[PDB]
Design a protein around this ligand. Structure first.
Ligand code: ZN
Lengths: 486, 213, 86, 221, 90, 34
RNA sequence: ACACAGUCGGUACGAAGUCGACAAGGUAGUUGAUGG
RNA sequence: GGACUCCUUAACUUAAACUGAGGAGUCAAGUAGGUACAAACCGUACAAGGAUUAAUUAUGUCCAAAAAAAA
RNA sequence: GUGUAUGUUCGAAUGCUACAACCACA
RNA sequence: CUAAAGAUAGCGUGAAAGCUCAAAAA
RNA sequence: GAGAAGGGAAA
RNA sequence: CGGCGGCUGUUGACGGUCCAAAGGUAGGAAAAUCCUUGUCGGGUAAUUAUCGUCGUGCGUGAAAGUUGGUCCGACUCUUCACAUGUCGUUUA
RNA sequence: AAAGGGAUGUUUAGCCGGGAAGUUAGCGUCUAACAAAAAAAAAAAAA
RNA sequence: AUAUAACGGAAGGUACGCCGGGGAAGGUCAGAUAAUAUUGGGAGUUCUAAUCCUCGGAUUGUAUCACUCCGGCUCAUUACUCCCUUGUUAUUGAACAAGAUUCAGUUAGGAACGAUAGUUCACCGUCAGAUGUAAUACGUGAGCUGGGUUAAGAACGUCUGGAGACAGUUUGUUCCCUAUCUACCAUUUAAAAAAAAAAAA
RNA sequence: UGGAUGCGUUAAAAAAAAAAAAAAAAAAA
RNA sequence: UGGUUGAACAAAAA
């Protein structure tokens, strides 16, 4: 018991007693005076080196640096952004809602503004870090993207092969650099930037060029580990390259140097599967999802090089992935938690009384025993699938979906469903009534094409005619009663 | 009041009675196995029946929880795993996947819930006069029967009461757990056995203790 | 008040409260308390558990806060004994 | 024999460890006010309307009481009734405007006040003391009194209090009956159009769509 | 029911509960022994209480609010009747 | 107990009143009990 | 008079006229500030 | 051969605006302010007299009642 | 689970009236 | 299956029987 | 947010 | 005018011892003395009243008079009777 | 400056206590708590 | 040498009283003590909590004991699940019947008379089968009585030498006020049915 | 040809009831 | 969460 007998018995004084006889607004004595820092960069660099896990702490560091200086060190800003992204980097247990909250926070916007203001200070050695942070936070910044992409295209021959692979995967995830023309320009309509069509394809072709050059200039230098190849790439890098090619639908890609050229996707799959056994595959992780998704999308879209792409992967690997798909792979690979736009549209649908809208509902071909994709909402009586695009637009009023949702769109097309995509950059501008009106107009274009399946709670219908007259008084018909009426 | 003025015990005595426990004669042992290990958490996943889809965003994505509760619906068209409709429910906290609401969602639409009351004694019998819902229960030889059609009317279309051939077992079945429990507990409150004579009803696995004068 | 010419300050404070006479009876008996305009259940002292910090002296607050804390509901409470802190 | 009435804590959870130990309401869950089902979603609230009449000098305020705290609304109403918002305020007259408050049935009191609160009315030389009436009883008989009794005792106790009191009009429902004063609850208007499409649409191939519809048709029905 | 000023778990099957009586009341429920069913309904009357703003003048050593200075201040040079008798060289 | 001496001071009295007992009684109890 | 019955303050003319009076009016000596 | 508050004490039932001591502060013999309301607590650049200027005392800043929450 | 209904007390005392001991299982 | 099991911690019987807990496994 | 223990009633 | 015992052995006829002028006798006696309503008896459904009685307790007490017979008193009390508005309880 | 009876005049105490009292009265004389610029314990020393 | 040791130096009564001056059932305190639970102990076949007795501490509280001019009648007002009546089905050492201990109200209707006695509280008797308790200046005497009790007379016992006296006992002994205000119960034509109210310039 | 009273007779139900004394969009009589 | 609710209960939660 902390009673402090010294105080309670009347031997010592209390701070409150002493201060009750002083002016109310005296200044507390600074017990310890230590010299304040002269250079802020090193101080905040040390603090950031200490902080890696709490986005609250990272943002507090940035806010304090902003309060102290109006032009914090650009390298420190880049490091802070990278740490914030790594907090959400691809293996965490965060929901997408947490990333959306961070994006909405004003401090995050101030950090992005500070980055944009001096974007000319970005060196070539920080572009992969920023692209990784963008992919992790699912925040596609069209202000900064042109400069980063210019750096990437300029340093094409100087990047490391695994860096090329990771950059291609991140760009495909963000939905940039695809093969569709007139869809890879940044800026407002009056001031449009360069067209970045085929950037991921050029990255993949550079990787293919290096791999072919290995055949001519092979070497037996030390490898970082058993899973690393001569170029320093692990199976994850090749699997991610294949996944990005699948996301952009560049199945028929090949290095133009030769007519008899093997598929680049086939090469990537082969070199991803070469150093892996079945026991290792069971624990590889994202590699399983990437490989099975590549095979499944290739089968669904039946491209020209489907046979070669399938022959790339070992049959034992295919069998293991097929039999283990529903155990952990898809559940661990799909986005976790909640999406705010999904919740908003779900509330709108409930208001409109669409009772057959299934959240995160999968669809597939008539003869597939397993489904590899999930729609944000599946209106199943109308053959409709509602998808949600919460990314930033390429410019004011120029939205675009991510590679994930583009591949899902193609898959749903192949399956035979109609696809309606809600773009948040437009949706957020509306209010409740306008949202309801526009959703009603959307549903008007897809009238009920089938009857809706009910999920009714079971009941004893045969008793529907029974009447409970609460407040019906007890009747005393006879004395003595022959029956004790309740 | 509290928050603006100290109590006499907290002021003069420092609330020592809070720590003046003896620590023996406990009704339970303390939890000594925690050890503050800081164990490795994992992403647990369960494949619930597709009827779990009845619980939508209001339950899965709109409730406030410490960690995310991921939900997905796999709707495809002896058991082999692949080729059936089900619901993936995942989280980093296994306690979420043991919620009774998830099982209630399925049971409400598939099979419901049931309870049993057991009657004992001489001249104790439950029957219908002449059919459902004219449930009657007599609790002795000279005892007039109890009319219970009102409870059947109360819980019509969601619960039913079945009687045994011997008129000694009353099974309450239904499709809402709370309603079934309330119906059964009214019936039990109202047919409860007298411990000195033992004539009456008792809830299954909860026998009444016989008393002696 | 009334036929009681002079009463205690605490009794007068209870008499002036603007609540139903039965909630006021609970307050008099100690099963309820009046606090900042509201009638509430009194704070619960749980043997072996730290009290809410508001109830302890400023110098005792740190020691009280270092004690074990109960963050469950009344059903989960395993404390051997409990009573209203006063 | 008689016993205590059923309060709000007889119809929900009780958490003695929380500051808000139980949710309290003016009525039971089944007795709370609601809009008639077919006559709903036809009205919207501007929440506050002001009418200026420079000729007579008698100005009007019309306020929506839906979702507001009794005391929080009463303080603002007292300010308006006194006229302390006016640069020509004078303590010796009812220098404020006239006030109409609607939706008094939907006023809120935080905590356990709905279950605990009582109101006293003095009775001269009465051996049983003042007449005490329950807050729930007042809410059932005349919801306007809940706001009126707070405003009256927030007004100064001088001889001008009855005048400002008389200049106040409170109503339980959404609409007031004053002939020449605008309403705050008004008919709803269609949402304004917009110049952008919030959604994009892509159509499945007709043959595949036909195949899928045919396949689903038998499985469903 | 056992009406108490304090509640305690008497066996492994006792548990704490809230009852919706005339008011909310704390209690103990037990499946095993009916005599273990308790209700915290008759505690001793609550204390008057000590306001928190009186703590500085209640707790700790308290020294006189008005100092004792006059006796030490006394001297003949400040008194008209006695100043003449004061001697600086005698 | 009763008002003329049992009444506590209030903010603005600095813990003293002309005929008050409560403060000195509390201090004595804290010092040497009762 | 609410008042040991006092004390300090205490209403701000006319247009109540009219053959009136920068940018717009759809001509009212009417009007300019305000999209989620 | 005064009163009350404070500090230290003897007597008292570690009681009393109880009784009795040693020192400071107010009242007594000092208004107007705060402390809800008839001395003793807080505060005063304490009241010769007049006036429609000003000040961070105690102490306040939802209303009775003067006093902050742009974009 | 098992020597074991351990010894003494007790008309008895078999883990659970009360005391002693509190050993024992490849 | 492994491993663990108080000359007994809570029930129960006139005495026995019977259930639980401790321990170990999962 | 306080003997907020003058009245109203506020986070 | 005034006064008229104490501590002890055998319930003590009968002794011991101290003191004194004498150690309160006869007769009243729970009294205008003592006292919350002493024991027993009459009166009552029930008797802190009253009468008789015991001499149990406190005691009183002999012309500063003790105990009695009859009659008496605008004296203080107990009991029976009477028609009764004293009363349940009031009305014309 | 004697004795007895009757008249006249005066007084018949302080302190604590309803009061009776009990005790007490010149001089000397035993029983004492206040705090850290009483702790190098804001100040000093050293640097 | 002397008395001042009361050491700055010893008759009493007054209830027949008189004059001048001044006033103790409360307000307050909380020791015993009252309420609530709680701790220890002792009872209850077995059992610390069905129930009973007692001890310590805690909080709350003031029925009883330790600043004026008794009792009864009449009329009452307020508190306390409180004496009878309620909670089918709290607990019970609850078969039933008669009961016990608490907790609980939108507080609903009710609880008769006497002997001795100045009495209150009590004892005894009848009826009934429903001890009630406390406060309101131990409610109420400008509303009543005056039995006790606290003046002048007088007597017994007892104390002194006495006058006289006794928190000993007795008998006798003038109980005022025409209601101004507050309160309450009754009570009250109205715009006019008294008089007057004369402008505009 | 009657009156009052209880020692006579009846009721013990209604309380949003029995009943009342101020119709009130009249904001400077 | 359920008019389920005089001293009685069911569902969910951690
Ligand atoms: Zn138990």
């Amino acid at each position: 018991v902390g009673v402090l007998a010294s105080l309670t018995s009347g031997q010592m004084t209390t701070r409150e007693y002493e201060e009750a006889f002083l002016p109310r607004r005296l200044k507390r004595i600074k017990v310890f005076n230590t010299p304040p820092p002269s250079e802020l960069p090193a101080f905040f660099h040390k603090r950031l080196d200490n902080a890696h896990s709490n986005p609250r702490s990272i943002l507090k560091l940035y806010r304090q640096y902003m309060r102290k200086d109006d032009y914090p060190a650009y390298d420190w800003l880049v490091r802070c952004f990278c740490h914030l992204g790594n907090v959400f980097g691809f293996n965490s247990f965060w929901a997408t809602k947490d990333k959306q909250v961070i994006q909405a926070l004003p401090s995050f916007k101030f950090l992005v503004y500070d980055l944009i203001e001096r974007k000319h200070l970005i060196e070539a050695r920080q572009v992969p870090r920023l692209l990784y942070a963008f992919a992790c936070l699912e925040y596609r910044s069209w202000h900064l993207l042109p400069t980063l992409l210019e750096h990437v295209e300029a340093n094409l021959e100087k990047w490391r092969t695994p860096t090329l692979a990771n950059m291609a995967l991140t760009l495909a995830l963000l939905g940039v650099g695809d093969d569709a023309p007139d869809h890879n320009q940044f800026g407002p309509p009056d001031l449009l930037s360069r067209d970045y069509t085929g950037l991921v394809s050029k990255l993949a072709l550079e990787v293919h060029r290096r791999l072919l050059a290995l055949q001519s200039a092979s070497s037996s230098g030390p490898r970082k580990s058993p899973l690393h190849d001569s170029l320093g790439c692990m199976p994850f890098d090749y699997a991610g390259l294949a996944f990005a090619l699948t996301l952009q639908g560049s199945y028929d890609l090949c290095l133009p140097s030769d007519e008899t050229a093997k598929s680049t996707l086939a090469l990537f799959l082969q070199r991803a599967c070469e150093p892996l056994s079945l026991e290792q595959l069971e624990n590889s992780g994202w590699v399983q999802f990437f490989l099975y998704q590549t095979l499944y999308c290739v089968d669904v879209e039946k491209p020209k090089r489907e046979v070669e792409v399938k022959k790339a992967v070992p049959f034992a690997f295919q069998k293991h992935l097929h039999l283990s798909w529903l155990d952990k792979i898809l559940i661990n690979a799909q986005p976790q938690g909640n999406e705010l736009l999904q919740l908003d549209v779900d509330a709108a649908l409930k208001r409109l009384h669409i009772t057959d809208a299934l959240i995160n509902c999968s669809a597939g071909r008539q003869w597939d025993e397993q489904h590899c994709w999930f729609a944000g909402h599946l209106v199943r009586s109308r053959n409709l699938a509602l998808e949600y695009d919460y990314l930033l637009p390429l410019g004011p009023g120029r939205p675009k979906v991510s590679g994930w949702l583009a591949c899902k769109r193609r898959m749903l097309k192949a399956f035979g469903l109609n696809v309606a995509t809600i773009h948040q950059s437009f949706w957020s501008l509306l209010n409740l009534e306008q949202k309801d009106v526009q959703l009603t107009r959307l549903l008007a274009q897809f009238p009920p094409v089938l009857e809706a399946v009910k999920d009714e709670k079971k009941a004893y219908e045969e008793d529907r005619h029974l009447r409970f007259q609460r407040h019906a008084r007890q009747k005393f018909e006879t004395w003595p009663p022959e029956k004790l009426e309740i | 009041g509290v928050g603006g003025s100290y109590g006499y015990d907290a002021f003069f005595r420092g609330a020592a009675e809070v720590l003046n426990g003896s620590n023996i004669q406990l009704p339970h042992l303390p939890e000594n196995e925690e050890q503050k290990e800081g164990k490795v958490y994992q992403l647990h996943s369960v494949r619930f029946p597709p009827q779990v889809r009845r619980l939508g965003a209001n339950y899965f994505f709109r409730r406030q929880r410490a960690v995310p509760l991921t939900y997905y619906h796999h709707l495809v068209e002896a058991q082999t795993g692949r080729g059936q409709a089900l619901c993936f429910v995942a989280s980093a906290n296994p306690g979420y996947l043991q919620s009774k609401e998830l099982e209630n969602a399925v049971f409400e639409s598939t099979r419901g819930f049931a309870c049993q009351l057991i009657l004992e004694g001489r001249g104790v019998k439950a029957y219908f006069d002449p059919e459902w819902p004219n449930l009657m229960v007599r609790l002795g030889v000279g005892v007039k029967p109890l009319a219970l059609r009102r409870l059947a009317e109360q819980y019509a279309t969601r619960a039913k009461i079945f009687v045994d051939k011997r008129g000694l077992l009353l099974t309450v079945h239904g499709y809402d757990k709370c309603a079934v429990g309330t119906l059964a507990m009214s019936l039990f409150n109202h047919l409860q056995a007298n411990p000195y004579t033992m004539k009456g009803a008792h809830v299954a696995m909860h026998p009444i203790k016989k008393k002696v004068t | 008040a009334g036929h009681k010419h002079s009463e205690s300050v605490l009794q007068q404070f209870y008499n002036r409260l603007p609540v139903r006479k039965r909630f006021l009876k609970a307050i008099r008996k100690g099963t309820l308390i009046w606090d900042k305009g509201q009638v509430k259940i009194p704070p619960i002292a749980m043997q072996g558990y730290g009290l809410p910090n508001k109830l302890v002296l400023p110098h005792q607050k740190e020691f009280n806060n270092k004690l074990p804390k109960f963050k469950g509901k009344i059903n989960q409470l395993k404390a051997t004994r409990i009573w209203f802190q006063d | 024999s008689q016993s205590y009435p059923k309060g709000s804590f007889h119809e929900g959870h009780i958490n003695p460890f929380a500051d808000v130990q139980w949710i309290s309401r003016p009525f039971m869950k089944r007795n709370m006010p609601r809009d008639h089902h077919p006559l709903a979603k036809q009205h919207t609230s501007l929440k506050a309307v002001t009418m200026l009449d420079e000729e007579s000098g008698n100005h009007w305020h019309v306020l929506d009481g839906k979702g507001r705290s009794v005391g929080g609304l009463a303080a603002q109403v007292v300010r308006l009734l006194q006229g302390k918002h006016r640069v020509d305020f004078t303590p010796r007259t009812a220098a404020g405007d006239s006030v109409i408050v609607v939706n008094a049935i939907h006023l809120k009191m935080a905590g356990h006040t709905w279950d605990t609160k009582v109101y006293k009315f003095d009775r001269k030389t009465h051996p049983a003391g003042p007449k005490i009436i329950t807050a729930k009883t007042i809410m059932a008989r005349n919801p306007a009194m809940i706001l009126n009794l707070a405003v009256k005792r927030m007004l100064p106790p001088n001889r001008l209090r009855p005048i400002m009191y008389r200049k106040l009009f409170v109503y339980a429902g959404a609409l007031h009956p004053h002939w020449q004063v605008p309403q705050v609850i008004v008919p709803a208007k269609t949402p304004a159009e917009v110049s952008f499409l919030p959604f994009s649409v892509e159509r499945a191939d007709p043959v595949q769509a036909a195949a899928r519809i045919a396949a689903l048709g038998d499985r469903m029905k | 029911m056992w009406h108490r000023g304090t509640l305690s778990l008497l066996c492994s099957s006792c548990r704490y509960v809230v009852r919706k009586w005339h008011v909310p009341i704390l209690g103990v429920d037990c499946n095993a022994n009916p005599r273990h069913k308790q209700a915290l309904s008759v505690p001793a009357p609550r204390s008057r209480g000590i306001p928190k703003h009186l703590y500085p003048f209640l707790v700790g050593k308290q020294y006189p609010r008005h100092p004792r200075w006059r006796q030490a201040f006394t001297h003949r040079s400040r008194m008209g009747k006695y100043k003449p008798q004061v001697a600086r060289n005698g | 107990n009763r008002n003329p001496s049992a009444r506590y001071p209030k903010k603005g009295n600095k813990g003293c009143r002309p005929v008050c007992r409560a403060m000195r009684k509390i201090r004595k109890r804290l010092r040497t009990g009762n």
